Design a protein around this ligand. Sequence first.
Ligand SMILES: *[C@@H]1O[C@H](CO)[C@@H](O)[C@H](O)[C@H]1NC(C)=O
Ligand SMILES: *[C@@H]1O[C@H](CO)[C@@H](O)[C@H](O)[C@H]1NC(C)=O
Ligand SMILES: *[C@@H]1O[C@H](CO)[C@@H](O)[C@H](O)[C@H]1NC(C)=O
Ligand SMILES: *[C@@H]1O[C@H](CO)[C@@H](O)[C@H](O)[C@H]1NC(C)=O
Ligand SMILES: *[C@@H]1O[C@H](CO)[C@@H](O)[C@H](O)[C@H]1NC(C)=O
Ligand SMILES: *[C@@H]1O[C@H](CO)[C@@H](O)[C@H](O)[C@H]1NC(C)=O
Ligand SMILES: *[C@@H]1O[C@H](CO)[C@@H](O)[C@H](O)[C@H]1NC(C)=O
Ligand SMILES: *[C@@H]1O[C@H](CO)[C@@H](O)[C@H](O)[C@H]1NC(C)=O
Ligand SMILES: *[C@@H]1O[C@H](CO)[C@@H](O)[C@H](O)[C@H]1NC(C)=O
Ligand SMILES: *[C@@H]1O[C@H](CO)[C@@H](O)[C@H](O)[C@H]1NC(C)=O
Ligand SMILES: *[C@@H]1O[C@H](CO)[C@@H](O)[C@H](O)[C@H]1NC(C)=O
Lengths: 50, 425, 197, 87, 33
Amino acid sequence: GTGVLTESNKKFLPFQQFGRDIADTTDAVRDPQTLEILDITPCSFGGVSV
Amino acid sequence: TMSLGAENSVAYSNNSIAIPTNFTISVTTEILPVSMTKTSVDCTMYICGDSTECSNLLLQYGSFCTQLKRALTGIAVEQDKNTQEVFAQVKQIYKTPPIKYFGGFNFSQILPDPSKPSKRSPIEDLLFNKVTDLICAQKFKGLTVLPPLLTDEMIAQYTSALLAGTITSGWTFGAGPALQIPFPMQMAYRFNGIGVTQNVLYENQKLIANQFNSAIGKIQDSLSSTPSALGKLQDVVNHNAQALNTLVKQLSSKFGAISSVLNDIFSRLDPPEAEVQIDRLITGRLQSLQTYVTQQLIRAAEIRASANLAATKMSECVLGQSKRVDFCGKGYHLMSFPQSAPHGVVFLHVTYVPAQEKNFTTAPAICHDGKAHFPREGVFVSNGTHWFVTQRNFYEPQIITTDNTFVSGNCDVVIGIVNNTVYDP
Amino acid sequence: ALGKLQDVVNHNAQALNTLVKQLSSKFGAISSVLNDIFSRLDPPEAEVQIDRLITGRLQSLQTYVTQQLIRAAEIRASANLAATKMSECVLGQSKRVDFCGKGYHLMSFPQSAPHGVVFLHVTYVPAQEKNFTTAPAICHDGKAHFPREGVFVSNGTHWFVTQRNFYEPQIITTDNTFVSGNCDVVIGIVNNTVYDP
Amino acid sequence: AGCLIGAEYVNNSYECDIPIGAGICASYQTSQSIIAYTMSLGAENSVAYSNNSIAIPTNFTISVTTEILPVSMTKTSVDCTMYICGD
Amino acid sequence: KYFGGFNFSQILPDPSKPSKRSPIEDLLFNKVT
Ligand SMILES: *[C@@H]1O[C@H](CO)[C@@H](O)[C@H](O)[C@H]1NC(C)=O
Ligand SMILES: *[C@@H]1O[C@H](CO)[C@@H](O)[C@H](O)[C@H]1NC(C)=O
Ligand SMILES: *[C@@H]1O[C@H](CO)[C@@H](O)[C@H](O)[C@H]1NC(C)=O
Ligand SMILES: *[C@@H]1O[C@H](CO)[C@@H](O)[C@H](O)[C@H]1NC(C)=O
Ligand SMILES: *[C@@H]1O[C@H](CO)[C@@H](O)[C@H](O)[C@H]1NC(C)=O
Ligand SMILES: *[C@@H]1O[C@H](CO)[C@@H](O)[C@H](O)[C@H]1NC(C)=O
Ligand SMILES: *[C@@H]1O[C@H](CO)[C@@H](O)[C@H](O)[C@H]1NC(C)=O
Ligand SMILES: *[C@@H]1O[C@H](CO)[C@@H](O)[C@H](O)[C@H]1NC(C)=O
Ligand SMILES: *[C@@H]1O[C@H](CO)[C@@H](O)[C@H](O)[C@H]1NC(C)=O
Ligand SMILES: *[C@@H]1O[C@H](CO)[C@@H](O)[C@H](O)[C@H]1NC(C)=O
Ligand SMILES: *[C@@H]1O[C@H](CO)[C@@H](O)[C@H](O)[C@H]1NC(C)=O
């Protein structure tokens, strides 16, 4: 997918690898190389009014 | 088994009448929704966001999202017009004079407080503090809340201008120019509008002022204690949430496909067989969004009907004195004061309620010299021995003279005629 | 000016226009033409290719109908409001403020228009107002006199009684005011002499 | 509401023409260009209220106001054998 | 039930029937199926 990846404060568990949301979408992930809780978030979007 | 009320047996006779001997100034409250939460969905991001393959396939399903966006824009414009047609009824913002002595009536609970940074009345503070993440977990999937045009400060200024015009001028600032008038005379006019004479107010001004102040003070306690008073507005805040969160829950449904994630379908299967798996999700999500829009249409229609009712009440109860029963309060409507609230308006109806009734002997007419004397404005009562004439809303016994009754024919065809002498000055 | 009548002509037209635009869409099929699908494919697959189009067109027509229902409900509400105004503003003189025109309602005239009614509300707006010194009541010989129908005003030196909508100064006499109690409990009492014809 | 680029924010408040949101409203004013500003609710009037003063009108005017109200729409009918299945 | 000469027997509830309805309400309920 696409989005912004930032450092998250979600206290994941050693066996937990992903993280869902209300709409069954992945909010946070774990980098397989270095153990770190990321945060998947799309960039800015909205409506263009002329 | 639920009770339908108490049991009252009003004694009905051909000769007795109940005349009220005192009165009460009751301030009731009425809550009316005006606007909703303007929401705007996204065409592609809700159906399939962060996916370039589905963005190309969604274009072959007609211009459904365009119609949905048009309907949402229409709903937003309608909710803005609903707020503009209720509070913005005057073209001149009035101001309260520095001296706040209006005869004895204390309006400190409804006038705006300049010390507070919100510039709202103490009642509006409780109204806004009792009507209350999910505002960021829904934005990332198209659900966007548009801010209203008229902010809370502008609605507060509109309500303050309406209150100033009602206190200083009365009902003259709604018809034409604002005509200044002392508040005791305005209250005397309000009393004359329902039948009570001006002397009843001018001789009991302190009692009426004390009753009005006590009712205004008890209104704050009633609104602060009971949490279900501001419910009709909270429902508008609740259902809208149920209209959004559920619309989010529809993104976790597979609609007969293998999964609810389009990335997992595009990565595993090839497009030739992923088309049929993506079409079910697209159709299901489009149908869910269409259902959301067609329900929000009915909700906006109901809210527009409520806003029209609130505007009619603002025009008939605040800008004047309506004689419609149970429209501007329960009883003899005296006046009304508007206040703002989150997506709603609160009308404080000041009403005249009779009390402490007493039983007297009545008669249709009297004749002194063989000619029936009918009351010009009032009713004939008796105290057991003498006959007096009093109005239909307050016991004020007066002698029967020639200027209080008119002659019409002889007293031979009327039923219930009693002989009594009249006075001639 | 005639915009409210134009909108119901525009949206309705749009309600048809989009209803046609849903006929050129595939709804997930191979095309939007029936004969092309029946000629390029086999009857076994023709059903699975045409049922999607049938369902899409059925859903479009159902959406059109369920939107026209709400539109007809709004039009029915507006027509009920117009009928109430015709019965109250034209057939009589209603005292409802901001219902039969901005100001003191005098009369109303109905006019027809394409799918609509235009009410010309003839009203009464005061103007050229001026200030006066008012008083709740007056007492001549120890008995308060309250105005029967009007208001006591003053021009600086004399006191008159005028109606509440037009400045018509009249001499305060015994037939313009009524006596009710003494002038001891009223706030703002001013002494002034009354006339008796 | 968001980020508005293309119009300058003037401090004086005029009558709102093109509503934007949250009190901000745009218009095309005077070289002429598009400006944005906080909409004005009306004129700041102050009634000289007093215990003894009353405003009595001395004349009047008869004015005719116009109110447009829709009554009906265009009756539309559709058929199944032609809209969905063309011949 | 002497109200001056007006007979409200057709609108007041009749205690004879067990339904405790007025003579007009009987026809109102017997015409809506
Ligand atoms: C009038 O009312 C009284 C009390 O109900 C009743 O006794 C009397 O009969 C009534 N009038 C006549 C003359 O019927
Ligand atoms: C009227 O009511 C008030 C408040 O209940 C009371 O103080 C006053 O004495 C009453 N006056 C009469 C006429 O009984
Ligand atoms: C009005 O009420 C306020 C409290 O909100 C009080 O401080 C003030 O003294 C009162 N004024 C009068 C006229 O009694
Ligand atoms: C009038 O008489 C009736 C008789 O039933 C009584 O119930 C009622 O309280 C009386 N009203 C007063 C307070 O005079
Ligand atoms: C009736 O009123 C007259 C005049 O006020 C009074 O003199 C008389 O005592 C009253 N009678 C009763 C029974 O109250
Ligand atoms: C009223 O007075 C007349 C003349 O005195 C008399 O004939 C008549 O009987 C009286 N009626 C009543 C109600 O007493
Ligand atoms: C007040 O009115 C009286 C009678 O019309 C007139 O004689 C007098 O001059 C007036 N005074 C002023 C100051 O207008
Ligand atoms: C009215 O007249 C009385 C008696 O002459 C006097 O005591 C009172 O002060 C006067 N009031 C005014 C308003 O001049
Ligand atoms: C109105 O009356 C109050 C109380 O007597 C007084 O404080 C105030 O100054 C008066 N204002 C005027 C003269 O309009
Ligand atoms: C009332 O207004 C009309 C029109 O302006 C004017 O001709 C007339 O003289 C005015 N009358 C008064 C009383 O000023
Ligand atoms: C009232 O009407 C009923 C029939 O409707 C009749 O039997 C009865 O006698 C009437 N009573 C009176 C007051 O005449």
